[PDB]
mmCIF file of C-alpha atoms and ligand atoms in Angstrom:
data_model
loop_
_atom_site.group_PDB
_atom_site.id
_atom_site.type_symbol
_atom_site.label_atom_id
_atom_site.label_comp_id
_atom_site.label_asym_id
_atom_site.label_seq_id
_atom_site.Cartn_x
_atom_site.Cartn_y
_atom_site.Cartn_z
ATOM 1 C CA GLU A 1 138.469 71.386 114.084
ATOM 2 C CA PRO A 2 142.011 71.785 115.588
ATOM 3 C CA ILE A 3 144.315 73.964 114.395
ATOM 4 C CA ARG A 4 147.713 72.009 113.380
ATOM 5 C CA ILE A 5 150.817 73.622 113.437
ATOM 6 C CA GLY A 6 154.213 71.942 113.450
ATOM 7 C CA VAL A 7 157.655 73.579 115.749
ATOM 8 C CA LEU A 8 160.761 72.397 113.804
ATOM 9 C CA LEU A 9 163.322 73.123 117.118
ATOM 10 C CA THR A 10 167.042 71.721 117.428
ATOM 11 C CA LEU A 11 166.232 70.838 121.222
ATOM 12 C CA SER A 12 169.118 68.626 121.778
ATOM 13 C CA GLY A 13 172.943 67.988 121.304
ATOM 14 C CA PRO A 14 175.008 71.557 121.954
ATOM 15 C CA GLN A 15 172.157 74.356 120.223
ATOM 16 C CA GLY A 16 169.677 73.246 122.321
ATOM 17 C CA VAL A 17 169.879 76.057 124.462
ATOM 18 C CA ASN A 18 168.741 78.119 121.830
ATOM 19 C CA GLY A 19 165.615 75.362 120.506
ATOM 20 C CA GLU A 20 164.259 75.571 123.679
ATOM 21 C CA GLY A 21 164.263 79.674 124.498
ATOM 22 C CA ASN A 22 162.555 79.535 121.263
ATOM 23 C CA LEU A 23 160.111 77.146 122.267
ATOM 24 C CA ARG A 24 159.442 78.060 125.572
ATOM 25 C CA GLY A 25 159.017 82.502 124.248
ATOM 26 C CA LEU A 26 156.955 80.300 121.758
ATOM 27 C CA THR A 27 154.279 79.062 123.657
ATOM 28 C CA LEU A 28 154.285 81.481 126.130
ATOM 29 C CA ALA A 29 152.324 83.712 123.430
ATOM 30 C CA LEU A 30 150.414 81.263 122.169
ATOM 31 C CA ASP A 31 148.801 81.023 126.295
ATOM 32 C CA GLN A 32 148.282 84.129 125.724
ATOM 33 C CA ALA A 33 146.741 84.323 122.682
ATOM 34 C CA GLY A 34 143.899 81.203 124.530
ATOM 35 C CA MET A 35 145.675 78.328 122.608
ATOM 36 C CA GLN A 36 142.553 78.612 120.160
ATOM 37 C CA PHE A 37 141.401 80.944 118.094
ATOM 38 C CA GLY A 38 136.753 81.521 116.690
ATOM 39 C CA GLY A 39 136.112 78.583 117.827
ATOM 40 C CA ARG A 40 139.646 75.693 117.703
ATOM 41 C CA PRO A 41 142.068 74.198 119.833
ATOM 42 C CA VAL A 42 145.546 74.766 118.663
ATOM 43 C CA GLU A 43 147.654 71.601 119.253
ATOM 44 C CA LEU A 44 151.772 72.236 118.954
ATOM 45 C CA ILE A 45 153.314 69.622 117.926
ATOM 46 C CA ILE A 46 156.913 69.483 118.098
ATOM 47 C CA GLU A 47 160.382 67.553 116.319
ATOM 48 C CA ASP A 48 163.773 67.689 117.215
ATOM 49 C CA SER A 49 165.789 67.946 114.354
ATOM 50 C CA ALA A 50 168.490 67.829 117.065
ATOM 51 C CA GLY A 51 171.134 70.443 114.763
ATOM 52 C CA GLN A 52 170.944 67.867 112.033
ATOM 53 C CA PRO A 53 170.184 69.144 108.035
ATOM 54 C CA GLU A 54 169.109 65.398 106.703
ATOM 55 C CA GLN A 55 167.127 65.067 110.517
ATOM 56 C CA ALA A 56 165.690 68.554 109.934
ATOM 57 C CA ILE A 57 164.795 67.165 106.162
ATOM 58 C CA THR A 58 163.255 63.896 107.720
ATOM 59 C CA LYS A 59 161.329 65.941 110.310
ATOM 60 C CA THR A 60 159.625 68.073 108.513
ATOM 61 C CA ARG A 61 158.740 66.188 106.427
ATOM 62 C CA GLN A 62 156.559 64.158 108.570
ATOM 63 C CA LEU A 63 154.831 66.944 109.949
ATOM 64 C CA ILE A 64 153.847 68.250 106.664
ATOM 65 C CA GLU A 65 152.781 64.753 104.939
ATOM 66 C CA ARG A 66 152.580 62.643 108.606
ATOM 67 C CA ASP A 67 150.450 65.417 110.587
ATOM 68 C CA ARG A 68 149.282 67.611 108.296
ATOM 69 C CA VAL A 69 150.420 70.245 109.710
ATOM 70 C CA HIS A 70 149.142 73.732 108.527
ATOM 71 C CA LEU A 71 152.501 76.154 109.944
ATOM 72 C CA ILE A 72 155.563 75.281 110.769
ATOM 73 C CA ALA A 73 157.544 77.883 112.819
ATOM 74 C CA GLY A 74 160.918 77.236 113.689
ATOM 75 C CA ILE A 75 164.241 76.396 112.042
ATOM 76 C CA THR A 76 167.212 76.814 114.344
ATOM 77 C CA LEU A 77 170.090 76.152 112.467
ATOM 78 C CA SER A 78 171.420 77.837 108.851
ATOM 79 C CA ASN A 79 172.133 74.111 107.242
ATOM 80 C CA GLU A 80 168.693 73.800 108.775
ATOM 81 C CA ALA A 81 167.642 75.558 106.557
ATOM 82 C CA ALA A 82 169.040 75.917 103.730
ATOM 83 C CA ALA A 83 168.073 71.771 103.734
ATOM 84 C CA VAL A 84 164.238 72.433 103.720
ATOM 85 C CA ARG A 85 163.680 75.142 102.140
ATOM 86 C CA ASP A 86 163.060 73.191 99.094
ATOM 87 C CA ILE A 87 161.246 71.009 100.555
ATOM 88 C CA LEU A 88 159.089 73.722 102.608
ATOM 89 C CA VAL A 89 157.974 76.180 99.605
ATOM 90 C CA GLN A 90 157.543 72.531 97.208
ATOM 91 C CA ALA A 91 155.289 71.571 99.417
ATOM 92 C CA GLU A 92 153.181 75.419 100.083
ATOM 93 C CA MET A 93 153.909 75.637 103.568
ATOM 94 C CA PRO A 94 154.094 78.645 105.786
ATOM 95 C CA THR A 95 156.473 78.595 107.453
ATOM 96 C CA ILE A 96 157.417 81.819 109.917
ATOM 97 C CA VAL A 97 161.857 81.576 110.405
ATOM 98 C CA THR A 98 161.886 81.951 115.047
ATOM 99 C CA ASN A 99 166.222 81.381 115.138
ATOM 100 C CA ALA A 100 168.154 80.469 111.594
ATOM 101 C CA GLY A 101 169.593 83.941 110.801
ATOM 102 C CA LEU A 102 171.028 82.830 107.435
ATOM 103 C CA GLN A 103 171.058 85.777 104.912
ATOM 104 C CA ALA A 104 170.332 84.457 101.982
ATOM 105 C CA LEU A 105 166.914 83.504 103.129
ATOM 106 C CA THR A 106 165.829 87.047 102.882
ATOM 107 C CA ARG A 107 168.353 88.410 101.480
ATOM 108 C CA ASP A 108 168.962 87.304 98.178
ATOM 109 C CA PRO A 109 165.560 87.053 95.832
ATOM 110 C CA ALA A 110 165.771 83.528 94.849
ATOM 111 C CA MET A 111 165.901 81.979 98.055
ATOM 112 C CA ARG A 112 163.228 83.863 98.967
ATOM 113 C CA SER A 113 159.706 82.434 99.163
ATOM 114 C CA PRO A 114 155.771 83.788 99.679
ATOM 115 C CA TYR A 115 155.545 81.430 101.826
ATOM 116 C CA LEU A 116 158.259 81.748 103.733
ATOM 117 C CA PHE A 117 158.979 84.624 106.528
ATOM 118 C CA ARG A 118 161.579 85.193 109.167
ATOM 119 C CA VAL A 119 161.198 87.413 113.101
ATOM 120 C CA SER A 120 164.467 86.926 114.606
ATOM 121 C CA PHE A 121 167.271 88.183 112.014
ATOM 122 C CA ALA A 122 168.637 88.042 108.691
ATOM 123 C CA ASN A 123 172.492 87.053 110.491
ATOM 124 C CA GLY A 124 174.011 91.323 111.068
ATOM 125 C CA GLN A 125 170.809 92.969 112.095
ATOM 126 C CA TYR A 126 170.858 93.928 115.363
ATOM 127 C CA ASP A 127 174.746 94.150 115.070
ATOM 128 C CA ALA A 128 174.577 96.329 111.887
ATOM 129 C CA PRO A 129 173.667 100.049 113.653
ATOM 130 C CA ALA A 130 175.948 99.863 116.316
ATOM 131 C CA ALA A 131 178.790 100.273 113.481
ATOM 132 C CA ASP A 132 175.913 103.565 112.614
ATOM 133 C CA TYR A 133 176.630 104.449 117.001
ATOM 134 C CA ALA A 134 179.703 104.027 116.423
ATOM 135 C CA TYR A 135 180.445 105.703 113.699
ATOM 136 C CA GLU A 136 178.078 108.885 114.605
ATOM 137 C CA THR A 137 178.622 108.939 118.260
ATOM 138 C CA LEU A 138 181.137 107.518 119.156
ATOM 139 C CA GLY A 139 183.367 108.914 116.318
ATOM 140 C CA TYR A 140 185.857 106.063 115.379
ATOM 141 C CA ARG A 141 187.157 105.915 111.758
ATOM 142 C CA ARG A 142 189.359 102.881 111.092
ATOM 143 C CA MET A 143 188.079 99.452 112.565
ATOM 144 C CA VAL A 144 188.819 95.132 113.316
ATOM 145 C CA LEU A 145 186.717 92.602 112.697
ATOM 146 C CA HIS A 146 186.320 89.822 114.328
ATOM 147 C CA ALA A 147 184.789 86.697 114.798
ATOM 148 C CA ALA A 148 184.676 82.807 114.644
ATOM 149 C CA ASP A 149 185.509 81.426 111.749
ATOM 150 C CA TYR A 150 181.639 80.360 110.422
ATOM 151 C CA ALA A 151 179.055 81.449 107.611
ATOM 152 C CA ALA A 152 177.351 83.819 110.787
ATOM 153 C CA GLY A 153 180.355 85.203 111.189
ATOM 154 C CA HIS A 154 181.541 86.345 107.717
ATOM 155 C CA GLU A 155 177.923 87.062 107.475
ATOM 156 C CA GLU A 156 178.416 89.291 110.922
ATOM 157 C CA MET A 157 181.199 90.975 109.660
ATOM 158 C CA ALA A 158 179.969 91.585 106.285
ATOM 159 C CA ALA A 159 176.827 93.786 107.213
ATOM 160 C CA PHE A 160 179.511 95.015 109.849
ATOM 161 C CA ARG A 161 181.128 96.755 107.322
ATOM 162 C CA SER A 162 178.883 98.109 104.815
ATOM 163 C CA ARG A 163 177.377 99.680 107.988
ATOM 164 C CA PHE A 164 180.920 101.427 109.343
ATOM 165 C CA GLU A 165 181.240 102.034 104.952
ATOM 166 C CA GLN A 166 177.738 103.424 104.272
ATOM 167 C CA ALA A 167 178.941 105.881 107.189
ATOM 168 C CA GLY A 168 182.525 106.867 105.783
ATOM 169 C CA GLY A 169 184.219 104.687 107.745
ATOM 170 C CA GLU A 170 187.185 102.379 107.117
ATOM 171 C CA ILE A 171 187.488 98.070 107.584
ATOM 172 C CA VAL A 172 191.764 97.356 108.407
ATOM 173 C CA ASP A 173 192.249 93.581 109.194
ATOM 174 C CA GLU A 174 189.026 90.918 109.971
ATOM 175 C CA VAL A 175 190.651 88.427 111.793
ATOM 176 C CA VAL A 176 188.744 85.090 112.162
ATOM 177 C CA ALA A 177 189.508 82.415 114.761
ATOM 178 C CA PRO A 178 187.970 78.605 114.828
ATOM 179 C CA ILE A 179 185.685 77.734 116.325
ATOM 180 C CA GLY A 180 186.518 75.754 120.080
ATOM 181 C CA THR A 181 189.261 78.206 120.472
ATOM 182 C CA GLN A 182 190.001 77.293 123.385
ATOM 183 C CA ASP A 183 193.490 80.330 123.793
ATOM 184 C CA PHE A 184 192.539 83.217 122.602
ATOM 185 C CA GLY A 185 195.718 84.844 123.404
ATOM 186 C CA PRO A 186 197.539 84.872 119.321
ATOM 187 C CA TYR A 187 193.796 86.246 118.020
ATOM 188 C CA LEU A 188 194.039 89.403 120.457
ATOM 189 C CA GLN A 189 197.643 89.928 119.156
ATOM 190 C CA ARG A 190 197.204 89.728 115.965
ATOM 191 C CA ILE A 191 194.182 92.570 117.075
ATOM 192 C CA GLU A 192 196.204 94.397 118.485
ATOM 193 C CA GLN A 193 198.815 94.952 115.396
ATOM 194 C CA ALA A 194 195.905 95.765 114.055
ATOM 195 C CA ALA A 195 195.028 98.098 115.588
ATOM 196 C CA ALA A 196 197.871 99.881 116.102
ATOM 197 C CA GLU A 197 195.763 101.721 112.846
ATOM 198 C CA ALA A 198 192.667 101.732 114.062
ATOM 199 C CA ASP A 199 190.805 103.500 117.448
ATOM 200 C CA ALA A 200 187.855 100.191 118.112
ATOM 201 C CA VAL A 201 187.388 96.587 117.441
ATOM 202 C CA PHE A 202 184.109 94.508 116.693
ATOM 203 C CA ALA A 203 184.047 91.084 117.827
ATOM 204 C CA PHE A 204 181.370 88.208 117.183
ATOM 205 C CA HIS A 205 181.065 84.249 118.075
ATOM 206 C CA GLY A 206 177.147 83.840 118.430
ATOM 207 C CA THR A 207 175.956 83.280 121.923
ATOM 208 C CA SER A 208 178.791 81.079 123.159
ATOM 209 C CA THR A 209 180.738 79.671 125.427
ATOM 210 C CA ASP A 210 183.442 81.065 122.916
ATOM 211 C CA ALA A 211 182.588 84.554 123.447
ATOM 212 C CA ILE A 212 182.960 84.621 126.926
ATOM 213 C CA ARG A 213 185.989 82.909 126.930
ATOM 214 C CA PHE A 214 186.910 85.885 124.391
ATOM 215 C CA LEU A 215 185.388 88.618 126.802
ATOM 216 C CA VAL A 216 186.742 87.327 129.696
ATOM 217 C CA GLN A 217 190.334 87.723 127.605
ATOM 218 C CA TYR A 218 189.647 90.665 126.158
ATOM 219 C CA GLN A 219 189.771 91.135 129.586
ATOM 220 C CA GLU A 220 192.511 89.721 130.759
ATOM 221 C CA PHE A 221 194.867 90.112 128.427
ATOM 222 C CA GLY A 222 194.773 94.348 128.936
ATOM 223 C CA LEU A 223 193.515 95.016 125.884
ATOM 224 C CA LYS A 224 189.975 96.250 127.543
ATOM 225 C CA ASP A 225 192.123 98.859 129.158
ATOM 226 C CA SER A 226 193.517 100.551 125.840
ATOM 227 C CA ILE A 227 191.465 99.369 122.271
ATOM 228 C CA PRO A 228 186.885 100.141 122.582
ATOM 229 C CA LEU A 229 184.976 97.032 121.585
ATOM 230 C CA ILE A 230 181.924 96.500 120.033
ATOM 231 C CA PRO A 231 180.359 93.355 121.197
ATOM 232 C CA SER A 232 177.916 91.654 118.927
ATOM 233 C CA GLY A 233 174.886 91.428 120.887
ATOM 234 C CA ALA A 234 174.715 88.288 120.754
ATOM 235 C CA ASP A 235 178.264 88.077 122.734
ATOM 236 C CA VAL A 236 176.176 89.534 125.849
ATOM 237 C CA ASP A 237 173.385 88.116 126.106
ATOM 238 C CA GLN A 238 171.473 87.594 129.025
ATOM 239 C CA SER A 239 172.280 83.518 128.465
ATOM 240 C CA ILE A 240 175.711 84.175 129.387
ATOM 241 C CA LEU A 241 176.073 87.785 130.539
ATOM 242 C CA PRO A 242 176.618 86.427 134.275
ATOM 243 C CA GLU A 243 179.703 85.176 133.963
ATOM 244 C CA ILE A 244 181.660 87.488 131.146
ATOM 245 C CA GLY A 245 179.629 90.114 133.531
ATOM 246 C CA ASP A 246 182.917 92.061 134.457
ATOM 247 C CA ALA A 247 184.439 91.649 130.961
ATOM 248 C CA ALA A 248 181.807 93.126 128.890
ATOM 249 C CA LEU A 249 180.777 95.953 131.207
ATOM 250 C CA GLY A 250 180.351 99.412 130.031
ATOM 251 C CA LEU A 251 180.064 97.762 126.260
ATOM 252 C CA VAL A 252 178.263 99.141 124.148
ATOM 253 C CA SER A 253 177.150 96.758 122.110
ATOM 254 C CA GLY A 254 173.830 96.220 119.554
ATOM 255 C CA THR A 255 171.144 93.494 120.391
ATOM 256 C CA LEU A 256 167.122 92.676 119.038
ATOM 257 C CA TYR A 257 166.078 92.961 122.878
ATOM 258 C CA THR A 258 166.491 92.878 126.294
ATOM 259 C CA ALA A 259 164.810 92.532 129.701
ATOM 260 C CA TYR A 260 164.979 95.856 130.800
ATOM 261 C CA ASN A 261 164.262 97.620 128.371
ATOM 262 C CA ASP A 262 162.176 100.653 129.485
ATOM 263 C CA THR A 263 158.748 100.180 128.045
ATOM 264 C CA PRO A 264 155.330 98.638 129.182
ATOM 265 C CA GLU A 265 155.799 95.576 126.857
ATOM 266 C CA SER A 266 158.434 95.013 128.236
ATOM 267 C CA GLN A 267 157.744 94.800 131.597
ATOM 268 C CA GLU A 268 154.873 92.707 131.049
ATOM 269 C CA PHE A 269 156.061 89.662 128.854
ATOM 270 C CA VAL A 270 159.001 89.751 131.826
ATOM 271 C CA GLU A 271 156.407 89.632 133.950
ATOM 272 C CA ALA A 272 154.664 86.717 131.618
ATOM 273 C CA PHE A 273 158.304 85.123 131.602
ATOM 274 C CA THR A 274 159.523 85.122 135.221
ATOM 275 C CA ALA A 275 156.384 84.101 136.894
ATOM 276 C CA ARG A 276 155.769 81.157 134.739
ATOM 277 C CA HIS A 277 159.913 80.320 134.936
ATOM 278 C CA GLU A 278 161.225 80.369 138.627
ATOM 279 C CA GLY A 279 162.491 84.690 138.597
ATOM 280 C CA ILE A 280 164.137 83.663 134.813
ATOM 281 C CA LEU A 281 164.607 87.013 132.780
ATOM 282 C CA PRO A 282 164.657 86.475 129.110
ATOM 283 C CA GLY A 283 166.417 86.689 126.634
ATOM 284 C CA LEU A 284 167.423 86.765 122.844
ATOM 285 C CA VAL A 285 165.967 83.441 121.948
ATOM 286 C CA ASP A 286 163.454 83.886 124.779
ATOM 287 C CA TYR A 287 162.114 87.261 122.855
ATOM 288 C CA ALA A 288 162.288 86.013 119.133
ATOM 289 C CA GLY A 289 160.488 82.613 120.100
ATOM 290 C CA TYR A 290 157.945 85.017 122.111
ATOM 291 C CA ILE A 291 157.219 87.569 118.716
ATOM 292 C CA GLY A 292 157.106 84.569 116.291
ATOM 293 C CA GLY A 293 154.548 83.295 118.925
ATOM 294 C CA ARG A 294 152.630 86.959 118.267
ATOM 295 C CA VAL A 295 152.921 86.840 114.596
ATOM 296 C CA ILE A 296 150.739 83.515 114.813
ATOM 297 C CA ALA A 297 148.590 84.279 117.090
ATOM 298 C CA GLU A 298 147.603 87.686 115.221
ATOM 299 C CA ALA A 299 147.453 86.492 111.796
ATOM 300 C CA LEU A 300 145.382 83.480 113.154
ATOM 301 C CA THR A 301 143.232 86.497 115.109
ATOM 302 C CA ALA A 302 142.731 88.363 112.011
ATOM 303 C CA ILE A 303 141.007 84.897 109.919
ATOM 304 C CA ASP A 304 139.172 84.076 112.529
ATOM 305 C CA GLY A 305 140.608 81.010 113.167
ATOM 306 C CA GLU A 306 140.448 80.071 109.280
ATOM 307 C CA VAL A 307 143.932 78.292 108.619
ATOM 308 C CA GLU A 308 143.240 76.005 105.317
ATOM 309 C CA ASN A 309 142.771 79.140 103.945
ATOM 310 C CA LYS A 310 146.074 80.036 103.078
ATOM 311 C CA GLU A 311 145.668 83.029 100.900
ATOM 312 C CA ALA A 312 144.396 84.885 103.566
ATOM 313 C CA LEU A 313 146.747 83.187 105.605
ATOM 314 C CA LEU A 314 148.959 84.807 103.956
ATOM 315 C CA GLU A 315 147.492 87.751 103.312
ATOM 316 C CA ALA A 316 146.766 88.026 107.256
ATOM 317 C CA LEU A 317 150.752 86.316 108.856
ATOM 318 C CA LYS A 318 151.902 89.715 106.121
ATOM 319 C CA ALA A 319 150.349 92.510 107.316
ATOM 320 C CA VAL A 320 151.010 91.768 111.356
ATOM 321 C CA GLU A 321 152.330 94.477 113.118
ATOM 322 C CA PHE A 322 152.510 94.600 117.110
ATOM 323 C CA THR A 323 154.192 96.409 119.777
ATOM 324 C CA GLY A 324 157.022 93.930 121.083
ATOM 325 C CA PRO A 325 158.487 93.572 124.438
ATOM 326 C CA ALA A 326 161.755 95.330 121.615
ATOM 327 C CA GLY A 327 158.669 97.801 120.407
ATOM 328 C CA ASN A 328 157.206 97.467 116.553
ATOM 329 C CA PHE A 329 157.272 94.594 114.432
ATOM 330 C CA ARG A 330 156.533 94.067 111.223
ATOM 331 C CA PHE A 331 157.223 92.508 107.888
ATOM 332 C CA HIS A 332 158.962 93.856 105.173
ATOM 333 C CA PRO A 333 156.244 94.162 102.393
ATOM 334 C CA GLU A 334 159.397 91.941 100.180
ATOM 335 C CA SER A 335 162.103 89.534 101.412
ATOM 336 C CA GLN A 336 159.035 89.008 105.127
ATOM 337 C CA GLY A 337 161.861 89.835 107.234
ATOM 338 C CA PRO A 338 161.795 91.543 110.176
ATOM 339 C CA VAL A 339 161.432 95.567 109.739
ATOM 340 C CA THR A 340 162.248 96.033 114.250
ATOM 341 C CA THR A 341 163.224 97.923 116.537
ATOM 342 C CA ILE A 342 167.039 97.746 117.260
ATOM 343 C CA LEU A 343 168.420 98.537 120.804
ATOM 344 C CA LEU A 344 171.946 99.965 120.984
ATOM 345 C CA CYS A 345 172.766 98.871 124.944
ATOM 346 C CA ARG A 346 175.957 98.817 127.737
ATOM 347 C CA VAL A 347 176.171 95.994 130.025
ATOM 348 C CA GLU A 348 175.973 97.958 133.506
ATOM 349 C CA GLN A 349 175.521 96.307 136.429
ATOM 350 C CA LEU A 350 173.185 97.249 138.687
ATOM 351 C CA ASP A 351 173.430 97.881 143.168
ATOM 352 C CA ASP A 352 172.366 94.117 143.364
ATOM 353 C CA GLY A 353 175.617 92.602 141.834
ATOM 354 C CA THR A 354 173.943 91.727 138.704
ATOM 355 C CA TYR A 355 175.074 92.738 135.361
ATOM 356 C CA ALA A 356 172.388 94.089 132.664
ATOM 357 C CA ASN A 357 172.173 95.548 129.152
ATOM 358 C CA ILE A 358 170.533 98.298 129.285
ATOM 359 C CA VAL A 359 169.240 100.398 127.046
ATOM 360 C CA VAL A 360 170.817 103.453 125.239
ATOM 361 C CA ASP A 361 169.379 104.491 121.826
ATOM 362 C CA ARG A 362 166.874 102.428 119.987
ATOM 363 C CA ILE A 363 166.944 102.521 115.876
ATOM 364 C CA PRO A 364 162.697 102.045 114.556
ATOM 365 C CA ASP A 365 161.477 100.476 111.785
ATOM 366 C CA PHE A 366 165.516 98.490 110.674
ATOM 367 C CA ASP A 367 165.243 96.148 108.742
ATOM 368 C CA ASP A 368 167.058 92.882 106.717
ATOM 369 C CA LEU A 369 167.887 94.514 104.117
ATOM 370 C CA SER A 370 169.710 98.051 104.014
ATOM 371 C CA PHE A 371 174.022 96.431 104.916
HETATM 372 CL CL1 CL F 1 175.656 107.630 106.033
HETATM 373 CL CL1 CL F 2 179.018 111.330 107.917
HETATM 374 CL CL1 CL F 3 164.610 79.376 131.810
HETATM 375 CL CL1 CL F 4 161.078 76.136 131.521
HETATM 376 CL CL1 CL F 5 156.631 99.505 112.460
HETATM 377 CL CL1 CL F 6 158.351 102.477 115.398
HETATM 378 CL CL1 CL F 7 162.947 100.209 103.025
HETATM 379 CL CL1 CL F 8 166.180 98.626 101.835
HETATM 380 ZN ZN1 ZN F 9 146.494 66.274 118.175
HETATM 381 ZN ZN1 ZN F 10 157.931 63.120 117.270
HETATM 382 ZN ZN1 ZN F 11 166.911 74.896 96.171
HETATM 383 ZN ZN1 ZN F 12 185.673 82.165 107.237
HETATM 384 ZN ZN1 ZN F 13 177.008 109.879 109.070
HETATM 385 ZN ZN1 ZN F 14 198.659 81.742 124.282
HETATM 386 ZN ZN1 ZN F 15 200.196 93.888 123.484
HETATM 387 ZN ZN1 ZN F 16 150.195 93.728 125.470
HETATM 388 ZN ZN1 ZN F 17 162.453 78.206 132.883
HETATM 389 ZN ZN1 ZN F 18 161.335 97.669 96.948
HETATM 390 ZN ZN1 ZN F 19 168.787 108.774 118.301
HETATM 391 ZN ZN1 ZN F 20 157.834 101.800 113.438
HETATM 392 ZN ZN1 ZN F 21 165.108 99.912 103.684
#
């Protein structure tokens, strides 16, 4: 009778804030759907991976072997994804990835699988349209790239470069800074110098204290006044927008979602989210969890809960389509990553003092293969 769904997330340690966001979005979607399908109650079995590959393995083995779940959602870190991929595939377990943006998982034909779906992004996917915007609308021809020095950072630089290069632009330098950098001074100076022969900078750190320290120092050091900057959408996420504030004002970025999107489905998700979370606005990770849950809900509805029929479950997941809070969402038929609407936004200040990502332009049907 019950429909058992495993959720593997990083819910403690410094990455726990991301898993928590995913879990809020996911449960909100399953609750709007009533937590039952075809007369069958859902039960979520939640396991914390603590951001650790070996614990991700243990947890994943347990949900499959002990808990006998019919589906797994989540996976916070790319290193956790890489460590459990083979287990999920060998077990023929339908899996909905809500965060881990590891490019290979959908883009490399050897890592992909019909059991793996991704509803968040491949790294770089929501930033790459900002490179089109930089070339086509802003007139930039030569850019400097900067990122925190880890895998997602490299992949975001590469995705940005690829689109900027395809439009006819050129990348003059890449500047990388270690994770947990306190003084961005030296990296800022290097960026300044590269930008003598450049029109603008793109920077990614993820939604992190790195991002806060970088943006704030970018302005304080004087570069905001002189060198246009396109932050990653992660770097101006809602959760940290109040602490940047003034440093990101007027900056344009690509993003997956903002609570200020002026569509009815976005307004409905903000209302249901804020009613549940004491006025707090949903951000990126909440959004991505929500799409996870809606996908599951739409697939389960279509097969009337007959979740043990894996063939029908997979065919139903492949066919899922709806208007979500960012726009229309579906899966690429070959990568099973997202084909979705990317929002180009600018940070603005509202009349009450609040900082907001405001939508200036939309790129529909942007897939994870086009960069
Ligand atoms: Cl082009
Ligand atoms: Cl062109
Ligand atoms: Cl919250
Ligand atoms: Cl909460
Ligand atoms: Cl569509
Ligand atoms: Cl569309
Ligand atoms: Cl395509
Ligand atoms: Cl394509
Ligand atoms: Zn139970
Ligand atoms: Zn447990
Ligand atoms: Zn392998
Ligand atoms: Zn590196
Ligand atoms: Zn063009
Ligand atoms: Zn210094
Ligand atoms: Zn200088
Ligand atoms: Zn609706
Ligand atoms: Zn809350
Ligand atoms: Zn094809
Ligand atoms: Zn347009
Ligand atoms: Zn479309
Ligand atoms: Zn395409």
